[PDB]
Design a protein around this ligand. Structure first.
Ligand SMILES: [Ca+2]
Length: 292
């Protein structure tokens, strides 16, 4: 059976304000509002948290039973919908450890993992996969492209006990690999020898012998060691929405934190998969109704 650590779909009207907590680190944070937007799959179902104010920082968070991903898979899933035609704005989530003051959440609050799309002009159009490791928030070496249109898109991060990850957009893989490879967590395995130097007596000839070419010998880095527990965090307790938007209107929906890939895939088919086709159809009616 799959452990559902967190599931949020905003289905019981206003009762979401009991689960979600507004930060007070700043006086002028933006308002989140329950909304399904101007076009949708289903009026009631596709209701989520919409950013309501232009040029504002955002800070809302939801807590759940503290758990650890030690020895098991972690899956973070949600849908983002940039209904506004977004110029610049984050669409990512943050997973925090235990002992976060929800009422004090800001950009510098120490998180475990940040995952999701970030857009700022044509220049920045990427999915962030950031792990907190030994005091450093390390960004993925892989350039993953985020979605920029007005429709709902599903973002999924899978993290496994064997230090492997996967990123899915719309239930299809876009990036894959191992944590050690696609981030710079560890020091390089093979440094150059700090005890060696040329040979001004080195002979670069093969005249008609003593040969080779001077390649500075590499040794094992004494301060390198494998870390099998990179994937592992001692506690996740809070999912935070900590963002900056210029043009507001982004709807977040269908959050899932789980330990099961199959369930996350199935839940995605059951949520984004149900939305996308009725959503596209409604926009097409509004757009042809705008022209003709
Ligand atoms: Ca919903």
């Amino acid at each position: 059976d799959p452990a559902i650590y967190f599931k949020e779909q905003f289905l019981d009207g206003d009762a979401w304000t009991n689960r979600w907590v507004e930060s007070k680190h700043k006086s002028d944070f933006g308002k989140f509002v329950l909304s399904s937007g101007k076009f949708y799959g289903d009026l009631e179902k596709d209701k989520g948290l919409q950013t309501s104010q232009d040029a504002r920082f955002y800070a809302l968070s939801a807590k759940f039973e503290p758990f650890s991903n030690k020895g098991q898979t972690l899956v973070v899933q949600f849908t983002v919908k940039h209904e506004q035609n977004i110029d610049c704005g984050g669409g990512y989530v943050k997973l925090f450890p235990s002992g976060l003051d929800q009422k004090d959440m800001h950009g510098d609050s120490e998180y475990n993992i940040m995952f999701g799309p970030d857009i700022c002009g044509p220049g920045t159009k990427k999915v962030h996969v950031i792990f907190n490791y030994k005091g450093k928030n390390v960004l993925i070496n892989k350039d993953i492209r985020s979605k920029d249109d007005e429709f709902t898109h599903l973002y999924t991060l899978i993290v496994r006990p064997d230090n492997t990850y996967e990123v899915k957009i719309d239930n299809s893989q876009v990036e894959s690999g191992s944590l050690e490879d696609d981030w710079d967590f560890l020091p390089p395995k093979k440094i150059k020898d700090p005890d060696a130097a040329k040979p001004e007596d080195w002979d670069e000839r093969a005249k008609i012998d003593y040969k080779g070419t001077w390649i500075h010998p590499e040794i094992d880095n004494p301060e390198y060691s494998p870390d099998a527990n990179i994937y592992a965090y001692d506690s996740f307790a809070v999912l935070g929405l900590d963002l900056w938007q210029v043009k507001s209107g982004t709807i977040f929906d269908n959050f899932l934190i789980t330990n099961d890939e199959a369930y996350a895939e199935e839940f995605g088919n059951e949520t984004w998969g149900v939305t996308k086709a009725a959503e596209k159809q409604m926009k097409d009616k509004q757009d042809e109704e705008q022209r003709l």
